[PDB]
Amino acid sequence: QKKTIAVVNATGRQAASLIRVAAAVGHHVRAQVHSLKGLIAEELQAIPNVTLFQGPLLNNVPLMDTLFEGAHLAFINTTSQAGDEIAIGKDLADAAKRAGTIQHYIYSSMPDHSLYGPWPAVPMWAPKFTVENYVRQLGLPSTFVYAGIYNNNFTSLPYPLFQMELMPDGTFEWHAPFDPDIPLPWLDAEHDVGPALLQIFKDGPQKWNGHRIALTFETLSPVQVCAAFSRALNRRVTYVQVPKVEIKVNIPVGYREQLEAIEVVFGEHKAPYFPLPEFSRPAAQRVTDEARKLWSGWRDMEEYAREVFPIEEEANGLDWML
Ligand SMILES: [Cl-]
Ligand SMILES: [Cl-]
Ligand SMILES: [Cl-]
How many A from CA of 95 to the centre of ligand 1?
A: 19
Say whether 237 sits in a helix, a strand or coil: strand
Pairing state between β 212-215 and 142-147: parallel
285 CB neighbour count, 10 Å cutoff: 9
Asked if residue 82 and residue 53 are part of one domain, the reply reads yes
Asked if residue 123 and residue 83 are part of one domain, the reply reads yes
Asked if residue 294 and residue 247 are part of one domain, the reply reads no
How many A from CA of 232 to the centre of ligand 1?
A: 32
Asked if residue 170 and residue 95 are part of one domain, the reply reads no
How many A from CA of 226 to the centre of ligand 2?
A: 13
Asked if residue 313 and residue 197 are part of one domain, the reply reads no
- By residue range, what is the domain housing residue 39? 1-148+188-216+272-298
How many A from CA of 253 to the centre of ligand 2?
A: 37
Record the resolution, in angstroms.
1.8
Three state DSSP letters for 54-122 = ECCCCCCHHHHHHHHCCCCEEEECCCCCCCCHHHHHHHHHHHHHHHCCCCEEEEEECCCHHHCCCCCCC
Asked if residue 77 and residue 159 are part of one domain, the reply reads no
Residue 61: which CATH number? Answer: 3.40.50.720
Asked if residue 241 and residue 95 are part of one domain, the reply reads no
Say whether 142 sits in a helix, a strand or coil: strand
Half-sphere exposure of 44 (CA within 13 A, CB side): 33
**Binding residue positions for NADP(+):** 9-14, 34, 77, 128, 150-153
Amino acid at site 312: E
Pairing state between β 104-109 and 73-76: parallel
Distance (Å, whole) CA 248 – CA 175: 13
Amino acid at site 233: L
Distance (Å, whole) CA 193 – CA 186: 12
**Binding residue positions for NAD(+):** 13-14, 77-79, 128, 150-153
Distance (Å, whole) CA 67 – CA 57: 11
Pairing state between β 218-220 and 149-150: unpaired
Write down how long the chain is.
322
How many A from CA of 16 to the centre of ligand 3?
A: 27
Asked if residue 306 and residue 170 are part of one domain, the reply reads yes
